[model samples]
Target: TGDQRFGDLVFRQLAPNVWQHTSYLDMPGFGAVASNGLIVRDGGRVLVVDTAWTDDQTAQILNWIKQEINLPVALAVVTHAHQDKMGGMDALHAAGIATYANALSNQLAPQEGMVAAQHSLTFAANGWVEPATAPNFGPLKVFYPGPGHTSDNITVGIDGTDIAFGGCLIKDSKAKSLGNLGDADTEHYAASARAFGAAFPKASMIVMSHSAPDSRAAITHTARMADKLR
Candidate 1:
C-alpha cells in the first residue's frame, strides 16, 4: 500500500506552454492511483485539469502548483463524477476555482453516488460527495466517450492543447475488466474507444486521471491489454 492516491504530484514540460503533472500515487494494487492535471500557461492565467483525491493529497499537489506559479487555480475540468477524479473539488471551490464536469455527471452523481459508497467503500473517507454546483468560470466542454468504464464516463479536451484527460473512461493500464461502466451501454465500450482513438494522433499527449500521459504506443498497448482482459 504505497498510498498512490496522490502521494506526489510532479510537473513535467511536455510542449511549449503545456505541462503535465504526474502524481506519484501509482501503486501496485492500483495501476496508477493518482489523478493527472495539466497547467496551460495562458499569458495571464492557467487552466488546470482534475484536482485529485483526498484533500491531504491535494495539499501535496497544491504545494507543487504554488511553487510553479503564484496565481490561484483558474479553472478545473472535472472529467467524471468519481471520488478519485473529483473528490478534491471543494478545496478549489472554496478558493473560488471555477470548476466544471460533464453535464451528465453533474446530473447523475449526487443521486446515485452516496447510495453506492455507503454500501461499497465503507471505510473510505467522507466529504467527497456533498452537493455542490459547478461554476461558470471559463469554457468547459464535455465529450461523451460512452461505454468505456461507465455509462456516464467522460473525456474532455483542453480547447487549445487537444490534450484530453480521460477520467475513468480509460483506467490505468488496460483495466482488470471493462470495469463497472456505471450504467453504460455494455456493447458500446469498444465504440467509445474508437471515438476517443480518432483523436489520438492530433492529441499530443494524453493525460489520464490514473495512468501516465499516453502516446500512440502506450494507448495501443492499453487496447491490447483491455482486449486481453475481456
Candidate 2:
C-alpha cells in the first residue's frame, strides 16, 4: 500500500507487481479530469500501459519508476490515439522506451497531433491483435473490439490477472452517460462494447481512462448506454 504522490500525479499499487498511475487534465466543462494508466513489473524491467495527458505528467511517471521503483521501462503501449492515452508519446520516446500501439492508432496519432508509437501491432482478420511472440511483455494482450470511443480505440489486458485497461472503449460504472463521443462510432458502439466484454470474460478489475477501476459489469453498463445511441 505504499502510494507515492508527485504533484498532480499519484501512483498506487493495484496488485502484485502492478501499479496504477493517475494524472489529471483540465477540461472546459468537466473541470479537472483524472486519467489512469498502468505500470507493470516485467522481470527486471517495467511496462507502461498508457501515458499521462501531457509530456510533463508522463515524465513524472518515468521519474517515479526510475527513482522509486528502480527499474527501466522496457515498453509502453498506448490503448488509443487520444491524448489521454498517448499524449506523452514524445516523453516516452525521449526516455528511450519502446512504445507500441495498434496500427490504426499509429495512423491516427499524427492527425491528433500526437507522436506515434515506435512499434505498431497489426490487427488480425478478427479485428484484434493477440499477444505477440516477440517484443513480448508477459501476458499483455491488446485488442481492438471494433470501434466505440474512436475508430482506433483498443483495450489492453494482462492475461492471468483480472486487470484490464479499457481506456475510453468501456465506460466507468459511475458514469451517467458515455462521455466524449466526438470521435465515437455510435452506430457500432454497442457492438464494440459487447465485443470488449467478450474479449476478457475473467477481467473484473477494469481500469478506465477517466475514472476509478470498476468491475466487469461496467462493460455491460457501457453496452447498455451505447444501445441508447442506436
Candidate 3:
C-alpha cells in the first residue's frame, strides 16, 4: 500500500534478482534507524546474512522473509559478535536455523565487550552475538576479512549468487568517519577491506549494513575521503 511500504523497510534488488532487507528500527529510546539483512533466494534454499538486533525484531525480519520468498533461512550468519548485528539468534536458533560467525568474534564478544548496548557511541551490550543454530548449508564459509569496524567483522558470500554482503567491514555512509575504534582493528580493518575487495572483485554488488549499497564510485568516494583524513 502506497509508498509507505518503502518506508516499512526499503527493499532494493541486487544482482540479477537477489534482494536485500533494510529494516528501519525506530524505538523511542533507540537510535538504530536501520537494521540490515540479506537474502539469497536460490532454488536450493535461502541464505540469510547477519541476523537482527532484538528478539522482537526477529518476527519483523521473518515478515520480510516471508514476503520476499518461500524458502527457509537455510543458513544464518552473524557478521561479528555485535548484538546490534546479531541479536536475533535466539529466535533463529529456536526455529532450527543453523547460524555461523567468525570464531574470533565469538571470542572478542564476551572478552572485549561490556553489558548494556546503547544506541549512541557505546560498546556495552554490543558484544554477545546471536547463538548457534542447525541448518542444511555447511561447511558454511565466513570470512573475517574485517577486524576493521570491529575486531571481528566478516563478509558473507552466498554460493551460486556470488553476491556478498559486506557487513561492518565496510564503512557506513551515515558514519561521519570510520567510527568508534575502541574495539576496532583499524589497521586490519583497512587491510581486510583491501583484501576482501581483491578477493571478491567479481562481487556484482555489496549491501552495507547500516547504510545501503555502494557502487564503484561510492566506494572510491569513501576511500578518497578516508585518504584525505589520513
| Top-scoring candidate (lDDT) | 2
Provide TM-scores for the models.
0.69, 0.95, 0.73
Of 2 and 3, which scores higher on TM-score? 2
Q: Write the per-residue lDDT of candidate 2 for residues 1-230, one digit (tens) a residue.
A: 66678877988888888889999888999999888899998788899999999999999999889887898889998889888899999999999999998888898888898899988887776766844622666767777889898998888788768898888888776689999999999999999988888888888899888877889778888999899998
Reference-based lDDT, residue 123, model 3: 20
Residue pairs in collision within model 1: 4-25, 149-181, 150-181, 151-181, 151-184
Ranking of candidates on TM-score, top first = 2, 3, 1
Q: Rank order by lDDT, top first? A: 2, 3, 1
True-structure lDDT of candidate 2: 0.86
Better by lDDT, candidate 3 or 1: 3
List runs of model 1 lying over 4 Å from the truth: 1-7, 23-32, 111-142, 159-162, 171-185, 199-201, 218-230
Model 3, runs deviating above 4 Å: 1-8, 26-32, 110-141, 159-162, 172-175, 221-230
Ten consecutive residues with minimal summed lDDT in candidate 2? 130-139
Pick by TM-score: which candidate is best? 2
Reference-based TM-score, model 2:
0.95
The digit string of per-residue lDDT tens for model 3 on 108-159 reads 5565442222111112132322223223443233454545667667665555
